[PDB]
Amino acid sequence: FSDTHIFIIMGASGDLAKKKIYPTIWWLFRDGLLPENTFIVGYARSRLTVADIRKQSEPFFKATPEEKLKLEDFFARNSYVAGQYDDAASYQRLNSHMNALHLGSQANRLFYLALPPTVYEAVTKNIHESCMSQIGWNRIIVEKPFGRDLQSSDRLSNHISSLFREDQIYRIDHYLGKEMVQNLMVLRFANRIFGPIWNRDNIACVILTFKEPFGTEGRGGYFDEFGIIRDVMQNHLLQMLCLVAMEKPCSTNSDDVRDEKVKVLKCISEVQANNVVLGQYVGNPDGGEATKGYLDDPTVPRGSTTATFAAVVLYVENERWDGVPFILRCGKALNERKAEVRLQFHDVAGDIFHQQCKRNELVIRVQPNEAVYTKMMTKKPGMFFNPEESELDLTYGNRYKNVKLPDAYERLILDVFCGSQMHFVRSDELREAWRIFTPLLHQIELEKPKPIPYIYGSRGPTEADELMKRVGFQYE
Amino acid sequence: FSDTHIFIIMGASGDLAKKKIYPTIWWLFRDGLLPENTFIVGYARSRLTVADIRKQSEPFFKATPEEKLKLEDFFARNSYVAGQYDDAASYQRLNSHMNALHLGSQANRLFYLALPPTVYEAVTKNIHESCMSQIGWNRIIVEKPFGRDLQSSDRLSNHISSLFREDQIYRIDHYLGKEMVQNLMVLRFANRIFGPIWNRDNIACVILTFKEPFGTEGRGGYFDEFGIIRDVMQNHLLQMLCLVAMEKPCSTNSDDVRDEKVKVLKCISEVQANNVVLGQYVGNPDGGEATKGYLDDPTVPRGSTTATFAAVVLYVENERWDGVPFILRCGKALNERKAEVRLQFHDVAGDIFHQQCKRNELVIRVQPNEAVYTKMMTKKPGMFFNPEESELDLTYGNRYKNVKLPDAYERLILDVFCGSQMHFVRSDELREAWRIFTPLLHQIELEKPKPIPYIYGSRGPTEADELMKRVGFQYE
Amino acid sequence: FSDTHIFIIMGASGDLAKKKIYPTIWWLFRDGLLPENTFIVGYARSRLTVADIRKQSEPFFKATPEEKLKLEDFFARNSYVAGQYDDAASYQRLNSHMNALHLGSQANRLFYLALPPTVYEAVTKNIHESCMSQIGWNRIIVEKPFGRDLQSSDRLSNHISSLFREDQIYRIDHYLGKEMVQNLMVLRFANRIFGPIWNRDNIACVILTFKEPFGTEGRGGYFDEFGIIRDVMQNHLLQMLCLVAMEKPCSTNSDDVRDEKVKVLKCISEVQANNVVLGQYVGNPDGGEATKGYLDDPTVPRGSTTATFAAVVLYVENERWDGVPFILRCGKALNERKAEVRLQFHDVAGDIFHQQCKRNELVIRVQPNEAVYTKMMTKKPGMFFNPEESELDLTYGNRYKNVKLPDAYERLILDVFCGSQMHFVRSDELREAWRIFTPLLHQIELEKPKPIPYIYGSRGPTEADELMKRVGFQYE
Amino acid sequence: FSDTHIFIIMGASGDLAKKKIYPTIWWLFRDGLLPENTFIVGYARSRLTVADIRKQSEPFFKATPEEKLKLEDFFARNSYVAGQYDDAASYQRLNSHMNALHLGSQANRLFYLALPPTVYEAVTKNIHESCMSQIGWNRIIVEKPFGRDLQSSDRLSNHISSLFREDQIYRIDHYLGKEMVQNLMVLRFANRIFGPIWNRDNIACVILTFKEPFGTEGRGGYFDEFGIIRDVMQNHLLQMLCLVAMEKPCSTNSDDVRDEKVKVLKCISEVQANNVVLGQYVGNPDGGEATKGYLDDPTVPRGSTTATFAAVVLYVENERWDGVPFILRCGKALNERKAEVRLQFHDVAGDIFHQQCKRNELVIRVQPNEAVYTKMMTKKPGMFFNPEESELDLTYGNRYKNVKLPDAYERLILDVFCGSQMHFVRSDELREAWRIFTPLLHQIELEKPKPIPYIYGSRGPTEADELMKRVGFQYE
């Protein structure tokens, strides 16, 4: 941490760069979390200056008047380099610009690819070919999409593998940076009270939920090509499945943890359409932005088939999980914002309360209002002896009010400086993900089934509820 | 419940009768919980009138101005009968007074013995000999002490057994009427989340705690004869042990439940002095009432040996519990009021967090501020990955604010009308209790060891803490 | 054991007395297992002599020439007393005959009732009224049938309860005296390897089997009144259910054990006809004694409905067993002699051998050729990797060859001298047994359904197999 | 399997080649287990002919007169090639000799390295450089030793990794080819009866035993350089530890299985000398070959320190195993031949048999007389109620008599043709093995402690027994 570090924002000119990456690296700098000797270098097609990037990005910093001195130090340690994405000369200028930086030939190089997936191969080759420290380490941060299926992801993933070792590749699933998501492991493996119950003997099912109350909101053109499954299920929701299901690792080292995650996936068969319900939101007449359907987006092809809601049931066919359905439910334009892990436990054996009991559930609400609670039965207070539902809760907000939770990107980026791959997608992890959904996704493309309509603002298709019931979920 | 009931307060003239029993039966009447056709009959040595009892007791009723009509109906359904406790004629007048009551020869008779233990034999014989309904049922409510040891309790208990069947005898441990105490069963057998963990594989120990911040406060003369163990441990604390430890019964019928309780006790060997630490409170110089010791009570014999604090460790030598110490800790003049069940779970197997973990605990606070919470580990919020202690809680007060909790005596008495023995001490239950402590208690009487002093307002003798540590409790 | 004991064979003149009881008490005497000072007194209607009883019974003794001295000592310690069963004078002579015996007024009195059930009340009253030692203890041995249903059994059982305390009543189920039957407890509670698996998580079902290859063989007249259920299922098979299912007791004391047995039963609902298949054997044309059906017995009413085969499924609705069917299968004139406990375990979770696995079973063969074995899977020996069925066995015969196993009656009678009720039916035990089958038995009497025919020498009705399959047994 | 295969015995001239490899490949050929179109090619320094190799090896074949036709076909499909081990020309002749073989350029090439470890690098390079099929697959079989410690093994292992992919490298631990050793997985994962008990809650320890009744018997010169640990413990015994301890894999694919094995090892800390007892055999005066010690070998350096017996205790620090000692006991010149896995289960909770119980054990005897049995408690047969030790056994010999068990090398070699790496040591597997023992082995070399003497024919040092006792083994 006494070494010089260079943080290279590739695609500096872009919106992600201006709205998220620059301010994220400001907040780590601001808070004194980065190495002392850190430089930021933007690179993009445009011919820009640090001055111009500051105008673009400084609105987004949430900067105060007492950070004026820090803000200027920060911009002092910024520079820019105009260049093209497959132009070997451009990378030459970039590499010697970096070398000209205080101890640049020594410095650890960190490349954030804030760019569309179409330039990834170009960029990763050029970086490898001409921008790599000879002394320092070189890490590369990459966002999704990682291919569109197993075949496309493999093409990309072999390219990069040919160029970089796994310990230089940091693929991002930003859910891996959320407070409650990271906390899953601690909940499970720090506590004895959650050990003996975490298996097929006690859990009737697991429900992994992703919901947003807004639709595609203008930009449904980008979405139409991807779909809800690819956008949210194959990545975020399955990451959570993995943390929920993984065996306990020997250590917290990055690859012991990821070995367990990938082991979970290897245990899961390809999804059969039989277990999938799809949905597409239509407008709501009885309601501004909610009045339009998915299709009333001008950016979305007429008569499109793309699903904005998917409910899918998976199985982890191993000793601990066999037969226990994992229900993955996701969609946009729904009744709420929520991201949630919910385990529904089995009924109690030998009931002595004449069926009045309700299944216990452990609930880890990821957002909003981060909390982890158990729904359980207690004797109805007062002059009664009938049990009733209640819950023991750890609601972050009451318990920890003062504390401010860092943003996923703040956490993750810091891990790249610190070298922790634990919270980043590995290549095997990545391909197991693709082989689980790939047959279904080709099917869909091939058979192009009409999603089930769902009115904007509802909980999604009734048929999704019907499915969950069929594999042994219980609504109460 | 359409039958006439007579509630006979034996010892009506006494303080318990005036401070607790009369007002308790008022509150059940007030709230419309008793049978419509209920009569209250006081019986005591004094020559009194309903008028006099009303003057004595009505202060204690918490009566309002809108209950004026109910208060008069209540006193209308009262009467008194002056009589002596071993005088056959007195019981004759009482029995025909009862007969003269609307359907008195039919009426179900309920006898509350609000009397010292010295008259129990006299009274129960006379009642049986001359006061028993021929048509209705006859139940008898009895409070402690039930003997002073196995031998004395057996003498009393054979007397009453000769006279009444078990289903006519309602022995009271008022702890059995507390909200959280009753709730133990529902916590355990309604929930799956507390099933798999409730055994020797997961629990390192159980701590059953009884504490009061006041001393004997003048009346240490009555206490000196009994001692903390007999006063609190042999009854209340062991009742809780039983509810904590009992196997799940087939049904909630009174005798299935009590079969399980008595089964637990049969599994417990006699306490050896080796596992007992005793204590006697001395005054605190640095503090009104706290300035005096136990011995500075004028009502307490000079140089007494009686213990006001006892810590004892027991074992339930069966499949589920073998080796798991149950720590019973009790005493007066301590740092707080608390009654509490605390299970301390074992460490987690295969720790991956470098010893930073702390043992989980499940805590059912009986009083004050009734609650049930789990102490567990959560990932330290914010930019950390180190677990820290936290808890999920169900605090009655936040969750159920509006609800008012009935008093133990309100609950129990109602059960006597309804005929539920589930919450009353059975004779076998009673004698198993005595055989567990009887050898120790005779020892004490015989060897009269000097209790360990403890300053008023402290947590009790350090040596108690030393003991708990020795059998595998962990302070953190 | 230095006291005088008198063993009173009531019904000495009868066949059971001559074929079993006399020789049984000879073998205990022969082997030096009885108290030194033991007398045998026969009592029956006939006017007999010790000489006559010796002629009747000595054939059955299996006596050798070196036991000549023991045989004469034995008959020396015999006497007889002619008397009637409800004649107060007869019991007077019997009681003073006993008194005239060396220390007879002191001697412990043991009454074996080798008599039909119709005289039980008469006999037990007279014994109590006039034959009871004032100094020694008095025990009474009683065989089935104990009533024909709950109501009749209660009448008998209240009679005897009025007269004798439970610790004087020794009701017999001779299955309780079989080597493998007694061994159940040791198998279960001595071994750790059979603890964790003994519950609803691992056992798919339990099959308790009773079979005989012979029919009623002439005496089907006595049987017609009783039926297979009453004859074998309500007693023997359910005793085995109890030993299989009971929780572990605290100690091996007689009443801790029996408390657990009766606890199991209390947990079982009344059998519904829905779970019962009945059978009656018809003759086999293709085969001496096997050529006749049940009905071709001259002693059996024409067109009788009595079942010689019953398959019934029961549930023990508690924490450990809930949902696990206990299949009780019994019948006469079947393919073999066998008495057997067979637990069929569930499939393994997360199968890695492509369905080639078979459910494990633990098997305790009670008779013939006493053994306890596990059927399990082993890698097919040789150049293979496919698992196949095999078994680990403890076959008594190979392992213990020299040892001769005492007869049930030898064991039990000795327990009556030693005072061990552990292996005898208690009154609560008895009535729980009756309430489980009583509704079904009245039904049958009322609706008189035609049993399903089954050819002599077969395994019984196909429909029985169909039932077992329906509640989750698997034939492989 | 319709392809041509070439089996290249490198070091054909050697004793292993003549005594084991040639006859092994004969027996697979003889039994029709190899591909139809198989050629055998010997290569060694000597200038030999097929004729000469046949003279050398045919004694060892166990050939009959009816295999005369098969024996000639076999030798017809043999050839030889004289060559040196680092001579590029020699490999050129070998590669074109192979090409000249019916479809040789197509044929799958199988290289058995029947050679000392000193030529491994030379040979594997030359093979890679010039002998590799362009069409067929090329596999290489390699025996131990694989380095002498982590550093030496890494040098070798990086060499070969540079040249060949893991799926071309077949490292041998011949224990992996033994019937009972392979059967471990089936025992564990095919059966439910061994699932719930296979963890730290039920197992007090595991004892992995290797013993031989003969010493080094002349060739103690080769041994002196290696030692018992390196010779037997680091490989065979730890392989068995792995099969005993591994989590259940998702599938039986080679790398799922090996992932679990290597996962076990990663969970094991480096052995501390504190847990090691070492031994060296001295002669026995009271006994031919047993009269000499290790040191009385002329081939062994005077005053050597090498251990012929090692007892070591290891821990697998994970959820399933934490705290359960794995006792590895091995040595030569001992009281017997035995290779054995023995699990000793914990005592039963809540003993009701007054300490008469003994710990249960599951025993898988690998050799001699292959068997798997459980030692357990049964009620002492006859007129007793005291439990005693007994066992349920599956003894191969009684149960499977006719069947002949193939030799480890027969099994393994066949797997190389079939392409199953499941039973071969992987590189990670290999290095985890080395890091566990490497610190201890350097210590020993450095501190050269004097092993504890042990008389030839005994069970080894008393101190080994003392150790086992200290970590919670119980001798009974």
Ligand SMILES: O=P(O)(O)OC[C@H]1O[C@@H](O)[C@H](O)[C@@H](O)[C@@H]1O
């Ligand atoms: O819940 P978050 O943090 O806002 O992230 C959800 C978003 O994550 C992105 O990965 C998806 O592409 C978006 O479709 C989705 O809306």
Ligand SMILES: O=P(O)(O)OC[C@H]1O[C@@H](O)[C@H](O)[C@@H](O)[C@@H]1O
């Ligand atoms: O906690 P509670 O409800 O006030 O009861 C505690 C009291 O209960 C009584 O049984 C004891 O005799 C008292 O000594 C004790 O103080």
Ligand SMILES: O=P(O)(O)OC[C@H]1O[C@@H](O)[C@H](O)[C@@H](O)[C@@H]1O
């Ligand atoms: O199997 P055992 O020991 O011979 O006993 C079976 C007999 O036991 C008796 O109880 C039954 O009345 C008979 O019907 C039955 O045949």
Ligand SMILES: O=P(O)(O)OC[C@H]1O[C@@H](O)[C@H](O)[C@@H](O)[C@@H]1O
């Ligand atoms: O038990 P097995 O099959 O004969 O193998 C034991 C031999 O295996 C070899 O690996 C060891 O080098 C020898 O020292 C050992 O004797």
